[PDB]
C-alpha cells in the first residue's frame, strides 16, 4: 500500500476519458462501479462543459456481483452504440472492474458491431492518468491507420498537425490558439488538431501533414513516434513555453519543413524582465514541480528569462525523468522524481524557497510553509480553467507567465521598507498588502536571525546551522550568523 494524501495523477481511465471527451464521434463504454461517474464533474464543473461526456458507465452494485456482470457490460455496449451512434468505440475498465476481469474490450469485438473498436488495457494499479491518455490516443490512431518535400512541389503552404492538447490538460484551450496564430504568421497552416476537437475521421488525415507538432509529449509522444515510423512524418521536440523555447521551436519546425528564416520582442516578457523594477527579482529562490514538460519549460524561464535561482526541481512524470535530471544537473541540483506529496513538501521545506512554481498540490504545502505560490501544471482545479485568454505557450503565453509568476512575490517598495523598518502596526513581517489582507541558538543568535527580512530567513537559518556544523562551532550566536553569510 502507498499512503497518498494527494495524488498528482488520477487513475489511467481518466486519461482515456480525457481523450474520448476531447474528441467528437468517439464514445467510451466504461465498466465501473456505481459512483465512478464523479469523473463527469471533471468535465461539467472544472472544464465547465455544457454537454455530458461521451461515456457510458455500467455502474454495477454489490448485488450485481452475485449475477452476470459480463452480460451487464454487453447490454451497455449495445445501448451506447444504438443511442449515440459513434464513429468509433472505446471499451475499458476502471480499477474495481479490473479486479473482476470481465474482459469487456474483447467482448465488444465479438458483438458484431460495424464500427472500429479500441479495447483498452489500462493497469489501474500500475499506471496513471497521462499514461492512460497516451496509451488510448496511441491505440486509437494505430488502430485507425495500421493498414495504411511534397509541399514545395504541390505549391501549397506547409501544414502541420497539432498533437497533444486535451481537456483537463493545462491551458490547452489557449495554447492551441496561440500556437496556431503564430504558425499562420510564419506561413504555416494547420492540418489536424488532435485529440482536442478531432473526430476519428480527422485522425485519418494525420499522414497528410508535412510535420507533427508535439505540444504535449506526456499525451502525444508515443503517437508521434508511431506516426514517424509508419508514415515518415517528422515531429518537433521543443515545446514552445517561454520566449527562448518558442524561438527554438520555430527554428526546429522550419528545419523539418525546409524553410529559411521569430523575433524576441514579439513577447513583452523580455522588456518587463529587463526593466528596472525586475532588478530585485535577481536571485529569488524558487522551487519547481509538476509534469515533465511544464517543469522543463519553467526551469529555463526561471533561470534564463527571469533571473531566479532554482533551488529545487522535480517531476511526477517518471517517463520524463532523465530529461528533468539533465536539466537539474545543469542547475547544479539533484532532481526530485516522485509522486509522493510528502516528499515534495519535505523538499520544499528543506530548501526554503521564496517562490514555489508547482501544481495545485503545492499550494497545500506552500500555505502551510507560508511561501508565495503559483500553479504551472496539472493537477489543477477550476481556477486554472479561466474565461479569459490564458495560454502558457508562445509570445502571449510568456506574457501571462510573467504576470502570474511575479504576482505572488512581495512588491519592490514594500519589500525594501520591511527590510528597513520592522516596528510597524500595519506593515508587519510577512505582510503583503498588494494581496489586500490585514544545534542550539543563543538569544543573541536568534536576534540576528530575526533581522533577516522574512522569505529569505528560512535559507539563512539553514545555511547558518550548516555552517556551524561545518566548523568546530558549538551553539550559535549573532557573529556566526554573519560568518555563515560571508562564507556562502
Amino acid at each position: 500500500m502507498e499512503l497518498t494524501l494527494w495524488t498528482y495523477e488520477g487513475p489511467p481511465h481518466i486519461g482515456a476519458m480525457r481523450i474520448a471527451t476531447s474528441m467528437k464521434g468517439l464514445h467510451y463504454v466504461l465498466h465501473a462501479p456505481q459512483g465512478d461517474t464523479y469523473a463527469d464533474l471533471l468535465f461539467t464543473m472544472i472544464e465547465r462543459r455544457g454537454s455530458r461526456p461521451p461515456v457510458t458507465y455500467t455502474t454495477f452494485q454489490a448485488r450485481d456481483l452475485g449475477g452476470d456482470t459480463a452480460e451487464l457490460v454487453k447490454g451497455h455496449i449495445f445501448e451506447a452504440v444504438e443511442r449515440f451512434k459513434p464513429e468509433a468505440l472505446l471499451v475499458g475498465e476502471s480499477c474495481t472492474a479490473e479486479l473482476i476481469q470481465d474482459q469487456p474490450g474483447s467482448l465488444a469485438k465479438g458483438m458484431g458491431l460495424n464500427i472500429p473498436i479500441v479495447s483498452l488495457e489500462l493497469p489501474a494499479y500500475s499506471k496513471k492518468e497521462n499514461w492512460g491518455a497516451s496509451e488510448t490516443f496511441y491505440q486509437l490512431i494505430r488502430g485507425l491507420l495500421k493498414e495504411i518535400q511534397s509541399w514545395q512541389e504541390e505549391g501549397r503552404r506547409p501544414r502541420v498537425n497539432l498533437l497533444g492538447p486535451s481537456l483537463l490538460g493545462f491551458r490547452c484551450r489557449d495554447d492551441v490558439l496561440e500556437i496556431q496564430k503564430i504558425l499562420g504568421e510564419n506561413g504555416i497552416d494547420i492540418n489536424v488538431i488532435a485529440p482536442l476537437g478531432a473526430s476519428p475521421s480527422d485522425l485519418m488525415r494525420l499522414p497528410k501533414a508535412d510535420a507533427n507538432v508535439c505540444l504535449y509529449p506526456e499525451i502525444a509522444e508515443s503517437t508521434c513516434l508511431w506516426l514517424e515510423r509508419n508514415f515518415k512524418t517528422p515531429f518537433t521536440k521543443v515545446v514552445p513555453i517561454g520566449v527562448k523555447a518558442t524561438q527554438d521551436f520555430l527554428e526546429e519546425l522550419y528545419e523539418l519543413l525546409g524553410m529559411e528564416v521569430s523575433n524576441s520582442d514579439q513577447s513583452k516578457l523580455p522588456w518587463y524582465s529587463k526593466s528596472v523594477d525586475s532588478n530585485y527579482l535577481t536571485g529569488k529562490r524558487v522551487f519547481i514541480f509538476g509534469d515533465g514538460t511544464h517543469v522543463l519549460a519553467a526551469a529555463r524561464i526561471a533561470n534564463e528569462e527571469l533571473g531566479f535561482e532554482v533551488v529545487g526541481i522535480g517531476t511526477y512524470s517518471r517517463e520524463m525523468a532523465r530529461k528533468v535530471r539533465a536539466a537539474a544537473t545543469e542547475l547544479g541540483l539533484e532532481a526530485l522524481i516522485t509522486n509522493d506529496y510528502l516528499e515534495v513538501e519535505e523538499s520544499i521545506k528543506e530548501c526554503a524557497p521564496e517562490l514555489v512554481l508547482g501544481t495545485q498540490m503545492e499550494r497545500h504545502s506552500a500555505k502551510r510553509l507560508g511561501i508565495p505560490c503559483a500553479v504551472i501544471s496539472t493537477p489543477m482545479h477550476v481556477q486554472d480553467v479561466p474565461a479569459r485568454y490564458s495560454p502558457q505557450m508562445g509570445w502571449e503565453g510568456a506574457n501571462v507567465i510573467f504576470d502570474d509568476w511575479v504576482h505572488p512575490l512581495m512588491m519592490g517598495l514594500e519589500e525594501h521598507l520591511i527590510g528597513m523598518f520592522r516596528h510597524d502596526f500595519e506593515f508587519t513581517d510577512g505582510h503583503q498588502s498588494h494581496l489586500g489582507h490585514l544545534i542550539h541558538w543563543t538569544s543573541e543568535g536568534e536576534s540576528e536571525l530575526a533581522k533577516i527580512p522574512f522569505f529569505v530567513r528560512g535559507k539563512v537559518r539553514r545555511n547558518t546551522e550548516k555552517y556551524a556544523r561545518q566548523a568546530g562551532c558549538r551553539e550559535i550566536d549573532g557573529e556566526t550568523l554573519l560568518d555563515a553569510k560571508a562564507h556562502f
Partner: protein, 417 residues
C-alpha cells in the same frame, strides 16, 4: 420501470439501469469539518484518491484531513500482508498528523470486493494505542453506499463507543449546521427538555452517552443502520417527519415534546411566534415557486422531504420524485404528508430518466453536477442537488432559507434574461 405499488395515496416505482450518484466516500467532504479532530483514511485505489481531492481539493489545506492508502500490485498479488501494510501506513500517517484523535479507515470498492478486513485492523490498531488514537472503520464503497449513506456508516461506527447511561436525554442524530444545532437546542430547552445532545458531536472524543431513557430524533432520512444500532443500545427511536420547512419541523419537534410529555399549551406558546414569522418570510419565495413544475433525480434520500416541503409550503407541482433508496418504514410519516398521486421512483436509469425530464421540460430540475450544466445548455433550469447537504436547512426558522435555495436559480434566470 416495473409494476407500481401504492402507499399513502402515492405511487412507488422502481427502475434499474445506469446510475449517476456519488459513492459513500464523499461523506468525508462534510464529516471532516463537522469533526476536525478526526482523519479519514480511505483504503482503495487511485480512483478513490482522485475522487476526494477532486471534491475537496479546490480548497487549500495546510494540514491534511483525509487521504488514501492506495492498493499496489503486491497487495493484490498477496505478496504483502494487508494487515502489516495497513499498520505501517497508519504509522507514518500519525507521524505527519500526530494530533489525530480518531482515525476512520474507510472501505472502498477495491477493499470491499477483495474483502480486506478493515474492521479487525481498526480493532487491532485501536489496541496498539488506546490512550491516544481511536481507529474505526466504515464502508463508503460505491457498490454498497450512495452519497449520504456514507454518514450512516460513519455514525454507526461511533455508536459502540458511546458511553452507557440511563439518563434523560434527547438525541439529535444526523449532521446539523452549527447554528442550526444551537437553535434547535435553544428551542428544546424552552420546552423544558434540559438534556439535548447532537450525534455526531463537534469533537470525535466527546460522544454523547446512550441507553434507555434516551429519545432519538432523526434529523436526516439516511440513518437506517445508525438508528437500528442506536435502538440496539436501549434508546427509543421517535417516529416523525424530517425537520424541513414549517410543517416538517413542527411535527418533528412535537414528536419529542409528546415523548417527554410536555404540555401542549407550552409547545404552542413556544412555536407560535416562530411559525407566524416563518409564514411571513416564506411569502416572496412562494410567489416565485408556486405553480412551478419540479423534477428531482436520486441523490441523497432528501428528495421525499424536499418534495413534501416544496409542494405543501411553496406550492410547487411534483413531476417525479427520485430516490436512490427508500426505507418505507422510515419515510412513513413523510409519505403521509406528501400530496396524493405523487410519483416516486426508487433506483434509476439515467438515460430513460433524462428522457422523462426532456419530455416534460420541468421548470426546475434538481440534479447532480454531472447533469446540471448539460441540462442548462438544453434550456432546462436546474438546482444542483448537493447544496442541501451543505446548507442550514433544518428548523422552523430555516424554512425561508430552504425555499430560497430553489428560488435562487429561477431568480437568476430572470436577472440574466
Amino acid at each position: 420501470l416495473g409494476s407500481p405499488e401504492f402507499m399513502s395515496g402515492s405511487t412507488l416505482l422502481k427502475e434499474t439501469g445506469p446510475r449517476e450518484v456519488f459513492c459513500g466516500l464523499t461523506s468525508i467532504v462534510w464529516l471532516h469539518r463537522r469533526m476536525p479532530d478526526a482523519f479519514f483514511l480511505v483504503v482503495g485505489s487511485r480512483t478513490c484518491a482522485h475522487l476526494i481531492q477532486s471534491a475537496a481539493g479546490v480548497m487549500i489545506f495546510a494540514e491534511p484531513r483525509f487521504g488514501t492508502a492506495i492498493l499496489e500490485e503486491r497487495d493484490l498479488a498477496g505478496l504483502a500482508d494487508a494487515h502489516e501494510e495497513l499498520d505501517r501506513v497508519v504509522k507514518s500517517l500519525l507521524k505527519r498528523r500526530p494530533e489525530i484523535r480518531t482515525l476512520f479507515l474507510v472501505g472502498s470498492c477495491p477493499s470491499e470486493v477483495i474483502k480486506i478486513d478493515l474492521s479487525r485492523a481498526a480493532e487491532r490498531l485501536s489496541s496498539q494505542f488506546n490512550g491516544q488514537v481511536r481507529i474505526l472503520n466504515y464502508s463508503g464503497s460505491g457498490i454498497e453506499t450512495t452519497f449520504t449513506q456514507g454518514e450512516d456508516g460513519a455514525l454507526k461506527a461511533l455508536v459502540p463507543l458511546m458511553p452507557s447511561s440511563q439518563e434523560e436525554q434527547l438525541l439529535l442524530a444526523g449532521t446539523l449546521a452549527n447554528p442550526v444545532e444551537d437553535r434547535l437546542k435553544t428551542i428544546f430547552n424552552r420546552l423544558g427538555i434540559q438534556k439535548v445532545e447532537s450525534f455526531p458531536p463537534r469533537e470525535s472524543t466527546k460522544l454523547p452517552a446512550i441507553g434507555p431513557g434516551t429519545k432519538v430524533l432523526l434529523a436526516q432520512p439516511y440513518l437506517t443502520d445508525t438508528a437500528r444500532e442506536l435502538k440496539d443500545r436501549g434508546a427509543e427511536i421517535l417516529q416523525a417527519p424530517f425537520p424541513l420547512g414549517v410543517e416538517g419541523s413542527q411535527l418533528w419537534i412535537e414528536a419529542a415534546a409528546n415523548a417527554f410529555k410536555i404540555k401542549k399549551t407550552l409547545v404552542d406558546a413556544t412555536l407560535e411566534p416562530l411559525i407566524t414569522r416563518a409564514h411571513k418570510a416564506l411569502k416572496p419565495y412562494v410567489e416565485q415557486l408556486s405553480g412551478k413544475k419540479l423534477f428531482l433525480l436520486p441523490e441523497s434520500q432528501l428528495e421525499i422531504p424536499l418534495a413534501r416541503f416544496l409542494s405543501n409550503e411553496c406550492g410547487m407541482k411534483l413531476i417525479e420524485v427520485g430516490v436512490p433508496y427508500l426505507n418505507r418504514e422510515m419515510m412513513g410519516p413523510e409519505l403521509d404528508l406528501l400530496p396524493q398521486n405523487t410519483r416516486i421512483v426508487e433506483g434509476q436509469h439515467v438515460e430513460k430518466q433524462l428522457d422523462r425530464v426532456r419530455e416534460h421540460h420541468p421548470d426546475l430540475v434538481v440534479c447532480g453536477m454531472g447533469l446540471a450544466n448539460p441540462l442548462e445548455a438544453e434550456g432546462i433550469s436546474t438546482k444542483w442537488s448537493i447544496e442541501m447537504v451543505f446548507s442550514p436547512i433544518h428548523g422552523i426558522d430555516q424554512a425561508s432559507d430552504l425555499a430560497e435555495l430553489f428560488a435562487r436559480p429561477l431568480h437568476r434566470q430572470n436577472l440574466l434574461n
